[PDB]
Structure 1
Amino acid sequence: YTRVVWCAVGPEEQKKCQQWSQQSGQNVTCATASTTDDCIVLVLKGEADALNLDGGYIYTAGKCGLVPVLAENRKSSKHSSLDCVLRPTEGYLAVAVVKKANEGLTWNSLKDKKSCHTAVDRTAGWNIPMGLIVNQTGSCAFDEFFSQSCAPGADPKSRLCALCAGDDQGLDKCVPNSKEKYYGYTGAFRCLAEDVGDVAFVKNDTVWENTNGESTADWAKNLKREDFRLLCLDGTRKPVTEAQSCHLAVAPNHAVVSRSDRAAHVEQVLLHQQALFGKNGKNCPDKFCLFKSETKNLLFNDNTECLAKLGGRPTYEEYLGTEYVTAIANLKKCS
């Protein structure tokens, strides 16, 4: 046993991490970087122990030798008989969302439209949709498909960043961290909600959690699910209640990664930390809730019920699944 150094991406995650550190009595301390890739590097250098990552980032981390430790597990879809920590993870639904009022828009008329992405390299926001588009257009010029986009992590002066807004002060336009107004699941959905973009590439859960009163945030408090539609691959449009039959793919759950030589220890500490601050945790809500951050999904997605043990001590390729790994590989050929 020892202290686990978490890596926070950006100043807001840093703040939440500091609160967690304080409440844990320094059982967890914080390192902070401006981007997920920088955090991946801190971990590789041994300057940080771990962080929770989207599948696309797990691919980057895995290539560099980091391993998955525990996976996010949400309010179980499959009516189970096992505890959350032991429950297998199902995966989330990557979807393409548009405004119902934007009537002519389908998967087949996306070219030259405006797009909102969680961030370059992320599963639902980038790898799945751009991999599909590259494949279908038979062209690697995915940076010329949409007329403008907000794809945090791309070149700030490029069309891929044209729609990004930066922070309060209008600084950090397109940075791949929560300071960018349209970053992540909620940022990309907001980009759609405010009609900055024509389509948003997020997950099923994002639409639900930010509509019909689920979010009191000012830009989301008035959003109605009926005002949105999902784009299915067969060219049809469906209500957001049909994500099961109208998604782009099933994505592997975000998961915690660490150096192989620190994995066992990181796992031990996290399992204990969630007993304290997770859902129903001894000290949540009274003191600190590890899986809450007012829909900002800081450190962990807010809809996380618990971090679950993995089956079969999977390598990053096994955790992500061969198909997805090859999909990423294929897309990477373009850059």
Structure 2
Amino acid sequence: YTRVVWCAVGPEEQKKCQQWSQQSGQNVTCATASTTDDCIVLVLKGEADALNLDGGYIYTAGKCGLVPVLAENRKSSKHSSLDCVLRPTEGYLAVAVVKKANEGLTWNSLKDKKSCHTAVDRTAGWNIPMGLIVNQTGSCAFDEFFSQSCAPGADPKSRLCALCAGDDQGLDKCVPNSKEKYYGYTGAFRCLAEDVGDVAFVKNDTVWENTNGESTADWAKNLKREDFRLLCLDGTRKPVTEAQSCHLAVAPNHAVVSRSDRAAHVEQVLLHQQALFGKNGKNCPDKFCLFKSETKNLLFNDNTECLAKLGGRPTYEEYLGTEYVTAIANLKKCS
């Protein structure tokens, strides 16, 4: 009656959830679904208690009455006097990335090129990019802007899924979970790295974590950051070291959500779970680390230092902020 049911998206998150369940003495248990939208439904039905979501999905969950509980907090320099759990969140930088060799490609010449997105409905991979393009274009034909793309969650027969590759066997092409090879931050960057796409819409941190030896993964071993460039909104190109002056927007951190009637209880359990399996936690290297999954960002982003309390007991609109909320509303008017 005090246990929390986590919702895992796909086979791989399920496996990691099972491990966390095991080490937690079943204080945390697992439900699995094929997509993030399905996990939201399980939560609404009361069959699952919570899951960690990107801002775009927090908008979906919010309209159905779910609420933000704790947020991911990564390592920062400016508010260092405070402990991580009480520290305000910074947000992450949504960027557009391309290969240096693809000279001449800028924000103003993206039309008819190939694109890589984390997934439809997500912040850096979809909502920010497509919202900007719709506006600048005065057209809701965002499905006709790029020639081909990999945008998990779109119609598998459409050009928005033309570049997705599915799993080991070619199955599940374009599904919005980690079985799709080019899903998420890591998948979209891989889509660019292997030159399947011309541009990838991810966040500043993804570039760094997958270049100059930070990943050991087969496809990323030899990637150097100097071989990449960020596309700035003023039509210019810059090194990935200038993200603070060349980003598409700053995004609200991913956060854990749950039904409001279950928030207090989910918050309590999670705080104890991270004291055990978090970054400096009692059991981390030794038995289990909640925030690691070999660059796959399973359940949580691998660069998470801790889950932080929110303060001001924000509604979902307050958490996302009015700038971002109006952006999504406007883009949704199209769909």
TM-score, with length taken from structure 1: 0.99
**Is residue 116–residue 197 contact of structure 2 (8 Å, CA) maintained in 1?**
yes
Distance (Å, rounded) in 1 between the aligned partners of 2:59 and 2:8: 19
Whether 1:12 aligns to 2:27 is no
Secondary structure of the corresponding residue to residue 143 of structure 1? helix
Once the two structures are superposed, residues 245-265 of structure 1 have per-residue CA deviations (whole angstroms, 9 ceiling, x without a partner) of 000000000000000000000
Distance (Å, rounded) in 2 between the aligned partners of 1:106 and 1:218: 29
Distance (Å, rounded) in 1 between the aligned partners of 2:22 and 2:40: 24
Distance (Å, rounded) in 2 between the aligned partners of 1:294 and 1:283: 18
Distance (Å, rounded) in 1 between the aligned partners of 2:311 and 2:203: 24
Secondary structure of the corresponding residue to residue 121 of structure 1? coil
Secondary structure of the corresponding residue to residue 324 of structure 1? helix
Quote the residue 2:239 is aligned against.
239
Once the two structures are superposed, residues 45-71 of structure 1 have per-residue CA deviations (whole angstroms, 9 ceiling, x without a partner) of 000000000000000000100000000
Once the two structures are superposed, residues 114-139 of structure 1 have per-residue CA deviations (whole angstroms, 9 ceiling, x without a partner) of 00000000000000000000000011
Distance (Å, rounded) in 1 between the aligned partners of 2:189 and 2:90: 23
Quote the residue 2:155 is aligned against.
155
The alpha carbon displacement at 1:20 in A equals 0.2
Once the two structures are superposed, residues 146-192 of structure 1 have per-residue CA deviations (whole angstroms, 9 ceiling, x without a partner) of 00000000000000000000000110000000000000000000000
Quote the residue 2:82 is aligned against.
82
Distance (Å, rounded) in 1 between the aligned partners of 2:78 and 2:111: 37
Quote the residue 1:43 is aligned against.
43
Once the two structures are superposed, residues 213-265 of structure 1 have per-residue CA deviations (whole angstroms, 9 ceiling, x without a partner) of 00000001110000000000000000000000000000000000000000000
The alpha carbon displacement at 1:78 in A equals 1.8
Distance (Å, rounded) in 1 between the aligned partners of 2:257 and 2:263: 8
Once the two structures are superposed, residues 94-127 of structure 1 have per-residue CA deviations (whole angstroms, 9 ceiling, x without a partner) of 0000000000100000000000000000000000
**Is residue 232–residue 247 contact of structure 2 (8 Å, CA) maintained in 1?**
yes
Distance (Å, rounded) in 2 between the aligned partners of 1:48 and 1:285: 28
Secondary structure of the corresponding residue to residue 120 of structure 2? coil
The alpha carbon displacement at 1:311 in A equals 1.6
Distance (Å, rounded) in 2 between the aligned partners of 1:287 and 1:280: 13
Give the gaps of 5 or more residues in structure 2.
Answer: none
The alpha carbon displacement at 1:284 in A equals 0.3
Once the two structures are superposed, residues 288-310 of structure 1 have per-residue CA deviations (whole angstroms, 9 ceiling, x without a partner) of 00000000000000000000000
Distance (Å, rounded) in 2 between the aligned partners of 1:60 and 1:49: 16
Distance (Å, rounded) in 2 between the aligned partners of 1:288 and 1:156: 37
Distance (Å, rounded) in 2 between the aligned partners of 1:247 and 1:52: 24
Give 4+ residue runs of structure 1 displaced > 6 Å after superposition.
none
Aligned residues between the structures: 335
Whether 1:93 aligns to 2:93 is yes
Quote the residue 1:332 is aligned against.
332
Quote the residue 2:201 is aligned against.
201
Secondary structure of the corresponding residue to residue 129 of structure 1? helix
The alpha carbon displacement at 1:77 in A equals 3.8
RMSD: 0.6
**Is residue 20–residue 288 contact of structure 2 (8 Å, CA) maintained in 1?**
yes
Quote the residue 2:298 is aligned against.
298
Distance (Å, rounded) in 1 between the aligned partners of 2:85 and 2:76: 11
Distance (Å, rounded) in 1 between the aligned partners of 2:238 and 2:328: 27
The alpha carbon displacement at 1:21 in A equals 0.2
Distance (Å, rounded) in 2 between the aligned partners of 1:331 and 1:31: 32
Matches within 5 A, 1:1-335: 2-335=2-335
The alpha carbon displacement at 1:320 in A equals 0.2
Distance (Å, rounded) in 1 between the aligned partners of 2:221 and 2:264: 42
The alpha carbon displacement at 1:211 in A equals 0.2
Secondary structure of the corresponding residue to residue 171 of structure 1? coil
Once the two structures are superposed, residues 62-87 of structure 1 have per-residue CA deviations (whole angstroms, 9 ceiling, x without a partner) of 01000000000001142420000000
**Is residue 93–residue 243 contact of structure 2 (8 Å, CA) maintained in 1?**
yes
Report the CA distance shift for 1:77/1:141 in structure 2 as closer, same or farther (over 3 A).
farther
Once the two structures are superposed, residues 6-28 of structure 1 have per-residue CA deviations (whole angstroms, 9 ceiling, x without a partner) of 00000000000000000000000
Distance (Å, rounded) in 2 between the aligned partners of 1:301 and 1:226: 24
**Is residue 79–residue 87 contact of structure 2 (8 Å, CA) maintained in 1?**
no
Of 165-174 and 71-80, more deviation after overlay is shown by 71-80
Distance (Å, rounded) in 1 between the aligned partners of 2:283 and 2:156: 42
Distance (Å, rounded) in 2 between the aligned partners of 1:238 and 1:101: 13
Secondary structure of the corresponding residue to residue 300 of structure 2? coil
The alpha carbon displacement at 1:30 in A equals 0.2
